[PDB]
Amino acid sequence: VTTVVATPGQGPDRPQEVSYTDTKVIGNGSFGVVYQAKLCDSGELVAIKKVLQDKRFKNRELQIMRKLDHCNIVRLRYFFYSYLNLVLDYVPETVYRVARHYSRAKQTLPVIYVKLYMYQLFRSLAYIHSFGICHRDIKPQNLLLDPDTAVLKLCDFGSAKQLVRGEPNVSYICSRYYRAPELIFGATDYTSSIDVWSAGCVLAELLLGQPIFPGDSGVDQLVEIIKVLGTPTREQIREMNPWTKVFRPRTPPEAIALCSRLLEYTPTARLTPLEACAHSFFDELRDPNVKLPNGRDTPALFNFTTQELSSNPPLATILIPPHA
Numbered sequence: 001v002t003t004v005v006a007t008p009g010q011g012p013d014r015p016q017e018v019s020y021t022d023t024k025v026i027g028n029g030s031f032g033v034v035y036q037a038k039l040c041d042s043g044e045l046v047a048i049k050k051v052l053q054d055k056r057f058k059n060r061e062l063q064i065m066r067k068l069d070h071c072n073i074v075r076l077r078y079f080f081y082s083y084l085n086l087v088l089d090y091v092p093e094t095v096y097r098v099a100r101h102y103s104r105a106k107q108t109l110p111v112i113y114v115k116l117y118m119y120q121l122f123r124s125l126a127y128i129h130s131f132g133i134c135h136r137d138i139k140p141q142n143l144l145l146d147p148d149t150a151v152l153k154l155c156d157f158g159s160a161k162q163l164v165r166g167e168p169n170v171s172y173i174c175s176r177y178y179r180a181p182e183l184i185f186g187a188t189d190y191t192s193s194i195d196v197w198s199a200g201c202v203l204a205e206l207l208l209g210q211p212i213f214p215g216d217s218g219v220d221q222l223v224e225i226i227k228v229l230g231t232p233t234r235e236q237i238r239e240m241n242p243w244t245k246v247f248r249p250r251t252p253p254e255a256i257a258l259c260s261r262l263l264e265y266t267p268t269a270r271l272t273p274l275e276a277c278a279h280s281f282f283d284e285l286r287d288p289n290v291k292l293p294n295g296r297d298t299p300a301l302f303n304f305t306t307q308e309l310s311s312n313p314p315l316a317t318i319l320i321p322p323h324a
């Protein structure tokens, strides 16, 4: 039974006495440890990300977390010190685990879940990007989901950085399979369109039932890309610095259409997260009768803020269906 005095994530600096029990480890990455705990009062489950802290500089992930507030991004409930502790919402499953179950069971995830999960990912991207913040590590392991509610929540802002024009950033960010070609070609002038490529990679993976561009070397990855995308033009190569034959037979044309538009050589040619949310493939979530397979209601999909829509406000005509 641990009792800390922590600062709430969002809101005014008014510290609270937070008490928790049943502290078990749940993850152990390079970044540090992730624990699961039960808050004594609420009885609610939480995840605590324990990272080492430099007096040298103030934690960037903490700085990024504190400003963020979206239905499709984990909540930083509290944060304290020891070294830096992130008391975040507990979310049971991950797109990684879900996709794996399905591939291990030789079937694919029902298209309703693909549309639901992808849209929510694109929304969190539309939001984060409308602050010049790039996630830099979109992978199914970082896409948390509650299976009953069907809500997806982006997590791991450990490598997220606010991208400023003219400022160069490391090309070694991003995990194998989801790396945008600019990154494979070691570009330092990359934009938030890198997250869109990674998002597109997740879409295709849920559709194919396995990674679209695998390989342990950049070379191997680039080959699997050229196999589907074709050979990049000298201009396409410069911008950096099949399709219907790719997917199984009854794959929605709209899903394949959405892929081609996200998985573009030219970082400029790729859809913006908002543009993707407004794609024909998501038209079913816009249906007033749309319900989850378990009979439950779909999560909030249209509560678009001025902030979220800032990217290009006219899209709200498509984004918010008349029934709202």
Ligand SMILES: Clc1cc(-c2c[nH]c3ncccc23)cc(NC2CCCCC2)n1
Pocket: 026, 027, 028, 029, 034, 047, 049, 074, 088, 089, 090, 091, 092, 141, 142, 144, 155, 156, 157, 158
């Ligand atoms: Cl910041 C951040 C937060 C969380 C997180 C928030 N709620 C959760 N509920 C259940 C499991 C993890 C979480 C996870 C990660 N990813 C790690 C999970 C453990 C294995 C390595 C990756 N990062």
